Enzyme design. Structure first.
Site, mmCIF file in Angstrom:
data_model
loop_
_atom_site.group_PDB
_atom_site.id
_atom_site.type_symbol
_atom_site.label_atom_id
_atom_site.label_comp_id
_atom_site.label_asym_id
_atom_site.label_seq_id
_atom_site.Cartn_x
_atom_site.Cartn_y
_atom_site.Cartn_z
ATOM 1 C CD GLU A 79 -2.599 -1.417 2.518
ATOM 2 O OE1 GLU A 79 -2.548 -0.556 3.414
ATOM 3 O OE2 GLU A 79 -3.420 -2.342 2.528
ATOM 4 C CG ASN A 102 -0.307 -7.091 -1.567
ATOM 5 O OD1 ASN A 102 -0.864 -7.772 -2.426
ATOM 6 N ND2 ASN A 102 -0.810 -6.924 -0.347
ATOM 7 C CG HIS A 119 -9.290 -6.397 0.859
ATOM 8 N ND1 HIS A 119 -9.614 -7.515 1.599
ATOM 9 C CD2 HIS A 119 -7.974 -6.166 1.079
ATOM 10 C CE1 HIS A 119 -8.538 -7.943 2.236
ATOM 11 N NE2 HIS A 119 -7.530 -7.142 1.937
ATOM 12 C CD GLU A 143 -4.039 -8.434 1.621
ATOM 13 O OE1 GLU A 143 -4.916 -7.859 2.287
ATOM 14 O OE2 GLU A 143 -2.861 -8.025 1.539
ATOM 15 C CG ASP A 200 -12.101 -9.601 1.722
ATOM 16 O OD1 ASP A 200 -12.099 -8.613 0.958
ATOM 17 O OD2 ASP A 200 -11.539 -9.602 2.841
#
Ligand SMILES: O[C@@H]1[C@@H](O)[C@H](O[C@@H]2CO[C@@H](O)[C@H](O)[C@H]2O)OC[C@H]1O
Ligand SMILES: O[C@@H]1[C@@H](O)[C@H](O[C@@H]2CO[C@@H](O)[C@H](O)[C@H]2O)OC[C@H]1O
Ligand SMILES: [Zn+2]
Ligand SMILES: [Zn+2]
Ligand SMILES: [Zn+2]
Ligand SMILES: [Zn+2]
Ligand SMILES: [Zn+2]
Ligand SMILES: [Zn+2]
Ligand SMILES: [Zn+2]
Length: 312
Positions: free
Chosen positions: A127, A168, A204, A232, A234
């Site tokens: 990030e 990432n 996400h 990651e 979801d």
């Protein structure tokens, strides 16, 4: 019949899940974790706050437990994460600006060296961009300057020549200001000979809001000469669950999986844990949740059916 991990591996990809040390006592949980997935990501214990709680004193105790567990089940492991503005021990901010680059390099060298030969990837920097594509003004950006990211990747490569090095970030699934900035950075790195092997799209997502340009975004990165991984995954929804929301979520998961399978260099998918029972979502996004393929009682959701179908 076949697990998500087995279906993914049949197509040259991995399908894994993140997990955290506090969850391991849950026997039903670990049983599924060890048999359904082919890859594992330590949710927290490889982060700076845990691995170097005091300057120059490293601690891999907790992270080791997760790596061993994965190895026991024959699952690969992604290292996560070396440089990040969050979950950073308080002492890092006290380091004199002129010493931070050395400190960041040292942190990376010790942790990468420690797990050398045991991990497939490392999320080296996490990030580093704002939504508009500008650099996040973290302690590293502010005190080291723009080159901190490049320096982090160089340090990682020097400590482990074989592990795949990934950048990432979230909100970089669709073509836009943020993914554009990452795209330019990768392009810049390849031009200058800065080591970088892949881009991790955290994924996400919000149910009903999956970026239509996902596939094209994954492909353009692949064309740059780097691999891509959904790290990651979801897809959260506004509670409570309804058959309609569950169905939308299923369609979304299927679309995301298909997008990856269509691109040769999309190496795999990792869900940020796999059961709503332990999802981080409710804690960070008030009123949202039910973001994973298994619900709180370990029942497979329509989303699971969609993932399996997409993997075939
Ligand atoms: O701390 C970070 C969270 O704030 C971040 O949440 C992103 C905010 O924008 C939403 O559109 C995204 O879906 C959501 O993930 O996630 C990463 C975490 O490190
Ligand atoms: O338990 C929570 C973790 O699941 C969470 O993991 C972060 C979520 O946002 C992502 O962008 C980060 O890469 C990932 O590490 O961190 C907070 C912790 O409380
Ligand atoms: Zn978890
Ligand atoms: Zn300890
Ligand atoms: Zn061990
Ligand atoms: Zn060591
Ligand atoms: Zn653009
Ligand atoms: Zn249920
Ligand atoms: Zn089914």
């Amino acid at each position: 019949t076949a697990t998500l991990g087995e279906l993914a591996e049949a197509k040259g990809r991995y399908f894994g899940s993140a997990t955290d040390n506090p969850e391991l006592p849950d026997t039903q949980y670990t049983q599924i974790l060890g048999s359904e997935f082919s890859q594992i990501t330590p949710e927290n214990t490889m982060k700076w706050q845990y691995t170097e709680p005091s300057r120059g004193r490293f601690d891999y105790t907790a992270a080791e437990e997760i790596v061993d567990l994965a190895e026991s089940n024959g699952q690969s492991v992604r290292g996560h994460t070396l440089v990040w503005h969050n979950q950073l021990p308080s002492w890092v901010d006290d380091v004199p600006a002129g010493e931070l680059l050395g400190v960041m390099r040292d942190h990376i060298t010790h942790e990468v060296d420690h797990f050398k030969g045991r991990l497939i990837h490392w999320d080296v920097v996490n990030e580093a961009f704002e939504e508009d594509g500008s650099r996040r003004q973290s302690v590293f950006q502010q005190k080291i300057g723009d080159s901190y990211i490049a320096e982090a990747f160089k340090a990682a490569r020097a400590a482990d020549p074989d592990v795949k090095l990934y950048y990432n970030d979230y909100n970089i699934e669709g073509i836009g200001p943020k993914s554009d900035a990452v795209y330019e950075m990768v392009k810049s790195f390849k031009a200058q000979g800065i080591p970088i092997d892949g881009v991790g799209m955290q994924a996400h997502l919000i149910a009903g809001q999956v970026p239509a340009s996902l596939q094209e975004n994954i492909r353009r990165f692949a064309d740059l000469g780097v691999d891509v991984a959904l790290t990651e995954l979801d897809i959260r929804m506004t509670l409570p669950r309804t058959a309609a929301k569950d169905a939308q979520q299923a369609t979304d998961y299927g679309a995301v999986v298909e997008a990856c399978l269509v691109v040769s260099r999309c190496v795999g998918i990792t869900v940020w844990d796999y059961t709503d029972k332990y999802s981080w979502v409710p804690s960070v996004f008030p009123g949202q949740g039910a973001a994973l393929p298994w619900d709180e009682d370990f029942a497979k959701k329509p989303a699971y059916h969609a993932i399996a179908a997409a993997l075939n």
